């Protein structure tokens, strides 16, 4: 009966935690986050070159935004629109020109390239940026774009 009283005690404590946490999830995402599925996009609010942006995300325990579906891309687009700043994606074709991959080396499972892209303009575009219209364009990694990580 004791273990029973203890189990019922935990049920209440857990119910409380779930309810309190549910509220704080909303508070946290406002105004720089976007939740899509099990993924959370969150912008740092400023721009940085690719390598620096990548470092920020990885050291934070996540990685640069990597939309893998129309839904994720649409969620990421909301942050880009909100900040009115094109953002860097995690993908590059730095290893093999013309072959874009995730930070793990895997090939793209989704893409939303603007017509004609990627075009490796000037023979020097190995990074990818997402516009406010949600379309993608390969861009020089040295350029500064909105830092958006995924967790």
Contacting residues toward Ca ion, per CB under 5 A? 28, 93, 97, 119-121, 125-126, 137-138
Phi, psi at 40, each rounded to 5°: -130, 125
Nearer to a copy of itself, 15 or 51 (CB): 15
Nearer to a copy of itself, 45 or 142 (CB): 45
Residues in a beta bridge with 92: 101, 127
Alpha carbon distance 133, 111 (integer Å):
14
**Total count of residues recorded for the chain:** 151
**Measuring CA to CA, how many Å separate 30 from each of 25, 34, 82?**
9, 8, 11
Query: Among residue numbers 108 through 147, which ones bind a copy of itself (CB under 8 A)?
Result: 147
Alpha carbon distance 71, 132 (integer Å):
15
Could you tell me which stretch among 56-64, 92-100, 118-126, 132-140 binds a copy of itself (CB under 8 A)?
Answer: 56-64
The residues of the shown chain that bind a copy of itself, judged by CB under 8 A, are 2-4, 6-7, 9-11, 13-15, 17-18, 20-21, 23-31, 33, 40, 42, 44-45, 56-57, 60-62, 147, 149, 151
């Amino acid at each position: 009966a004791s273990l029973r009283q203890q189990v019922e005690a935990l049920q209440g404590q857990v119910q409380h935690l779930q309810a309190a946490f549910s509220q704080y999830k909303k508070v946290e995402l406002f105004p720089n986050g976007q939740s899509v599925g099990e993924k959370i996009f969150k912008t740092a609010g400023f721009v940085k070159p690719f390598t620096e942006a990548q470092l920020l995300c990885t050291q934070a325990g996540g990685q640069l935004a990597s939309p893998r579906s129309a839904a994720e891309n649409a969620a990421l687009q909301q942050l880009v629109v909100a900040k009115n700043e094109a953002a860097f994606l995690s993908m590059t074709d730095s290893k093999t020109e013309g072959k874009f991959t995730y930070p793990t080396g895997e090939s793209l499972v989704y893409s939303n390239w603007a017509p004609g892209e990627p075009n490796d303009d000037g023979g020097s575009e190995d990074c990818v940026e997402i516009f406010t219209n949600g379309k993608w364009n390969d861009r020089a990694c040295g350029e500064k774009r909105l830092v958006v990580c995924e967790f």
